[PDB]
Design a protein around this ligand. Structure first.
Ligand SMILES: Cc1cc(=O)oc2cc(O[C@H]3O[C@H](CO)[C@@H](O)[C@H](O[C@H]4O[C@H](CO)[C@@H](O)[C@H](O)[C@@H]4O)[C@@H]3O)ccc12
Length: 349
């Protein structure tokens, strides 16, 4: 079929599975959240907490689905239908290395739900305690062994793909051991080989030799807030793509619809990026496409604390907070606008 509605499997949408309810988790996990002290506010701060009540959740927006559980199979079905609406073929699942049965259950539920809609799943490997290339190898082996035969497990030209958040916190001399074909614990040419996509943060002077010396297959930028880093400044994307092409690397710029995290970081207003009825998202997505990249990542499906979510949000005013909402747009606007941009992306692939 050639309907212009099909999923795109070079479009990766960052997905968070850390939400709970008192009932599916024993607590409205993540809907309740600590408020961060101001790093420039001095000692003795008592910033308090957001209790995750109906009235007061840890977001500047309010989900259409309410204070949902990421383990609720009925929520997961709805989320996969939202991915289908957005045409986002790959769910890039945040992975925290919790090593508990509830994590294992949730990952299985997500894979199963995704497969029903032909969605694929890859892992976004977060920075967990004592993360290093040896335990990262062991965890890559574990993920590929546990999930690699699941029909929803993502592969690109036969290889799994991992996004590695905060990769720059591990020295290239360590990465080389894992990612050079000659590295002492290499995954190259093994059953556990994968496309490893590192987080490009700062200037090319630093990031170019890092990516080469660490033997990453590519890089992404994550941040939805334009100008937060060099990498998340879209005017740099043409140049970053040129360098990627010259060096055989895969650039997967990250685009998002806005940013606001001031419920949890009241002092962080400088990072706010207003949605302007979709114009911010449009501008950022257009820059990614114009850069001529082969793949795009979306920050985020549902990072509600960041205010970067494309998941449907609704107007809500409670006794505790007046939430932002999608304004003149309907709750599903960012899903349907994602589908629009996926179509434009596919037209120039
Ligand atoms: C200021 C700011 C701007 C922006 O564009 O994006 C972010 C993102 C932040 O962190 C989110 O994304 C990370 C990558 O997936 C993830 O590691 C973060 O979660 C972890 O850190 C937070 C504290 O920042 C912690 O509460 C959570 O339990 C994790 O340990 C988060 O999802 C932060 C700031 C931004």
């Amino acid at each position: 079929n050639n309907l212009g509605t099909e999923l795109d499997y070079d479009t990766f949408c960052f997905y968070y599975d850390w939400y709970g309810s008192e009932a599916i988790d024993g607590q409205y996990r993540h809907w309740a959240h600590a408020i961060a002290p101001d790093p420039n506010g001095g000692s003795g701060q008592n910033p308090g907490t957001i209790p995750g009540t109906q009235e007061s959740i840890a977001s500047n927006f309010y989900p259409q689905l309410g204070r949902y559980s990421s383990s609720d199979p009925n929520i997961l079905t709805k989320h996969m239908d939202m991915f289908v609406m957005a045409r986002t073929g790959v769910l890039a699942l945040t992975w925290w290395n919790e090593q508990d049965e509830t994590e294992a259950k949730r990952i299985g539920l997500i894979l199963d739900a995704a497969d029903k809609k032909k969605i694929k799943v890859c892992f976004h490997l977060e920075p967990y305690p004592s993360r290093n290339v040896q335990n990262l190898r062991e965890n890559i082996v574990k993920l590929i062994t546990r999930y690699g035969n699941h029909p929803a497990f993502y592969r690109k030209d036969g290889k799994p793909l991992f996004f590695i958040y905060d990769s720059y916190l591990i020295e290239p001399s360590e990465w080389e051991k894992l990612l050079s074909p000659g590295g002492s614990i290499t995954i190259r040419n093994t059953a556990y080989d994968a496309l490893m996509i590192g987080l490009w943060t700062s200037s090319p002077t630093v990031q170019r030799p890092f990516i080469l010396n660490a033997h990453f297959d590519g890089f992404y930028t994550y941040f939805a807030a334009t100008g937060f880093t060099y990498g998340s400044t879209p005017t740099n994307w043409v140049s970053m793509q040129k360098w990627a092409k010259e060096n055989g690397k895969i650039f997967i710029p990250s685009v998002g619809p806005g940013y606001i995290d001031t419920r949890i970081r009241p002092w962080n207003g400088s990072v706010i990026r207003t949605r302007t009825d979709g114009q911010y998202y449009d501008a950022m997505y257009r820059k990614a496409i114009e850069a001529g990249v082969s793949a795009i990542s979306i920050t985020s499906f549902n990072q509600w604390h960041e205010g970067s979510q494309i998941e449907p949000a609704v107007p809500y005013t409670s006794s505790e907070f007046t939430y932002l909402d999608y304004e003149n747009r309907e709750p599903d606007y960012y899903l349907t606008r994602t589908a629009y941009w996926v179509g434009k992306f596919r037209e120039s692939k």
